[PDB]
Amino acid sequence: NAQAEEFKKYLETNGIKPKQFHKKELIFNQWDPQEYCIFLYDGITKLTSISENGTIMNLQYYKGAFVIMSGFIDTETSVGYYNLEVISEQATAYVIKINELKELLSKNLTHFFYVFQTLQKQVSYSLAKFNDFSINGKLGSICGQLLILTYVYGKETPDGIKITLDNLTMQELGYSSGIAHSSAVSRIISKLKQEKVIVYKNSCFYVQNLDYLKRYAPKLDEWFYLACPATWGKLN
Amino acid sequence: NAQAEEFKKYLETNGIKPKQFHKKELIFNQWDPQEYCIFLYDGITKLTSISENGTIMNLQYYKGAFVIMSGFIDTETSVGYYNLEVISEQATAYVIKINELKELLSKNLTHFFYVFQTLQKQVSYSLAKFNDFSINGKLGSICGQLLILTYVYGKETPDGIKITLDNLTMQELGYSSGIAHSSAVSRIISKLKQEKVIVYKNSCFYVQNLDYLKRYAPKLDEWFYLACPATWGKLN
Ligand SMILES: N[C@@H](CCC(=O)N[C@@H](CS)C(=O)NCC(=O)O)C(=O)O
Ligand SMILES: N[C@@H](CCC(=O)N[C@@H](CS)C(=O)NCC(=O)O)C(=O)O
Ligand SMILES: O=P([O-])([O-])O
Ligand SMILES: O=P([O-])([O-])O
Ligand SMILES: O=P([O-])([O-])O
Ligand code: NA
Numbered sequence: 001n002a003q004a005e006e007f008k009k010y011l012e013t014n015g016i017k018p019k020q021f022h023k024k025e026l027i028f029n030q031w032d033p034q035e036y037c038i039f040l041y042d043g044i045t046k047l048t049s050i051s052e053n054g055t056i057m058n059l060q061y062y063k064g065a066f067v068i069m070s071g072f073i074d075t076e077t078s079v080g081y082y083n084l085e086v087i088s089e090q091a092t093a094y095v096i097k098i099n100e101l102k103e104l105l106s107k108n109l110t111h112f113f114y115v116f117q118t119l120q121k122q123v124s125y126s127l128a129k130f131n132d133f134s135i136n137g138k139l140g141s142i143c144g145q146l147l148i149l150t151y152v153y154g155k156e157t158p159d160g161i162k163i164t165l166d167n168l169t170m171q172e173l174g175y176s177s178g179i180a181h182s183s184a185v186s187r188i189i190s191k192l193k194q195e196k197v198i199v200y201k202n203s204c205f206y207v208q209n210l211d212y213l214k215r216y217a218p219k220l221d222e223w224f225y226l227a228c229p230a231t232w233g234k235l236n
Numbered sequence: 237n238a239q240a241e242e243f244k245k246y247l248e249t250n251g252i253k254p255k256q257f258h259k260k261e262l263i264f265n266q267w268d269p270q271e272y273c274i275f276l277y278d279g280i281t282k283l284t285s286i287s288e289n290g291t292i293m294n295l296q297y298y299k300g301a302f303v304i305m306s307g308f309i310d311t312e313t314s315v316g317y318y319n320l321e322v323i324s325e326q327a328t329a330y331v332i333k334i335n336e337l338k339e340l341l342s343k344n345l346t347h348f349f350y351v352f353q354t355l356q357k358q359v360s361y362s363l364a365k366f367n368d369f370s371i372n373g374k375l376g377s378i379c380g381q382l383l384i385l386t387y388v389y390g391k392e393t394p395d396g397i398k399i400t401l402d403n404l405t406m407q408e409l410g411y412s413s414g415i416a417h418s419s420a421v422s423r424i425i426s427k428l429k430q431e432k433v434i435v436y437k438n439s440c441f442y443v444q445n446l447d448y449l450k451r452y453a454p455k456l457d458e459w460f461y462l463a464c465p466a467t468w469g470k471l472n
Contacts, residue, residue: 049367049455057367074353078462079360080455106345113338116348117310119355124315126362131285131293133370134414141370178370219285219316226314 003114004065008041010111011094014104021091028070030081035071035098037115038084040064043091044153044165048083048175058176060129063152064092067118071098073105087166121227128219133178136216141177142188143216146198150207151224151231160199160206161235168205210235239350240301244277246347247330250340257327264306266317271307273337273351274320276300279327280389280401284319284411294411296365299388300327303354307334309341323402357463364459369414372452377413378424379452382434386443387460387467396435396442397471404441446471 132144
């Protein structure tokens with residue numbers, strides 16, 4: 001990622017130091033009024049929200065390089081209360097106060113357009129996700145989430161496309177899919193297993209019929225093709 | 237409003253002319269190869285996706301002023317294929333070819349930050365919406381959609397918060413909530429009318445218990461209070 005590499009140097013030139021975060025640590029949390037611009041440079045995270053009754057929702061994962069905003073650039077107020085939890089072992093994040101972002105970007109438009117590009121990908125990612133997760137009930141939600149996971153963390157193997165995430169549980173899939181009961185997730189995953197769309201080996205999920213997932217997640221496959229052509233081409 | 241007015245003036249100074257659209261017309265469509273930046277100045281539109289079999293997904297509405305992107309600024313590639321359909325009797329929009337937007341924003345940081353702000357509001361809207369529409373099943377989806385419509389198009393009256401849309405139908409709510417058949421939508425709407433949450437009179441829906449909707453759409457309620465406080469204050 002060339003544009004992300006130059007944006008890293010620029011932040012170090014301007015005195016923003018890398019911060020090391022560890023698995024299960026929260027880079028920010030929904031119970032703290034802190035507005036940031038997190039340039040996640042390396043590692044994997046998940047954006048989560050917890051209800052007043054304990055319902056956990058995984059809004060999405062982020063895999064560096066990428067930008068996550070918790071406050072508005074103009075009003076410096078909160079965009080909404082979320083937690084950014086690290087799920088990889090180590091994560092390298094450049095934490096920026098929202099009150100100093102406007103000046104950092106105005107100075108250098110190349111960097112400003114990089115952050116803007118990142119936000120455009122975020123906008124269209126969420127739209128595609130909303131479409132695919134809505135039109136085919138919970139089957140499409142699971143297939144949509146599996147397709148995302150296959151593209152962003154998958155690697156080709158003879159057993160299929162291995163989703164390389166440590167402890168991807170039925171529970172997590174449920175939190176990413178709006179399914180609170182792990183057993184309800186299993187009922188869908190089990191059906192996908194009998195049709196041999198996926199197999200569970202080596203504590204990992206192997207996707208064996210990608211075309212099946214595409215059929216129940218068409219706008220997400222379209223989005224990866226248009227927005228992440230290199231990610232899409234690795235598995236096609 | 238103010239920032240949008242200045243952006244409108246700026247657009248006309250650079251030769252971008254306003255264009256009138258009438259109900260049902262598509263400002264852009266999902267088979268067009270050309271991509272745009274649409275500055276919706278006035279009117280109401282919906283962003284849709286039509287599947288091969290003619291199934292319709294309503295991704296959301298847009299009420300001017302706002303910015304809708306169909307292509308990436310940095311690559312001039314499509315972000316995903318959607319239709320932008322006018323649902324007000326008339327809409328006024330400035331149609332900016334995507335390959336001209338980079339220069340327009342480079343030349344004026346005030347407007348660059350305005351467009352950036354609108355994309356941030358899009359991001360936070362979609363995340364909140366995704367949280368509420370996923371958690372409480374179909375009821376949460378309808379209540380969340382109704383809450384959105386209450387805040388954006390609602391008018392206080394002695395009979396309740398009048399959703400001021402011409403012909404809000406049961407199918408339209410289904411398209412917007414991701415629900416297959418009008419059957420389940422009628423089943424939910426019936427129960428909500430029974431519980432005094434809403435009523436249908438004068439060919440419009442009136443919300444009589446806003447707190448019931450807040451209960452099933454807390455993240456969207458949070459988002460209107462944080463990102464559209466004036467809009468939120470209208471009803472609280
Ligand atoms: N660094 C990669 C990935 C950035 C990223 O995390 N993108 C989000 C979409 S806005 C994503 O792919 N999320 C995958 C998930 O939800 O697991 C890139 O720039 O393409
Ligand atoms: N022009 C108003 C409204 C802009 C707008 O349409 N925002 C979207 C969210 S990105 C919305 O409220 N949609 C309501 C809906 O989906 O009905 C503003 O700038 O606050
Ligand atoms: O729609 P569903 O299949 O019931 O999820
Ligand atoms: O998740 P669960 O409920 O335990 O199944
Ligand atoms: O929607 P429906 O199928 O007619 O019920
Ligand atoms: Na277009």
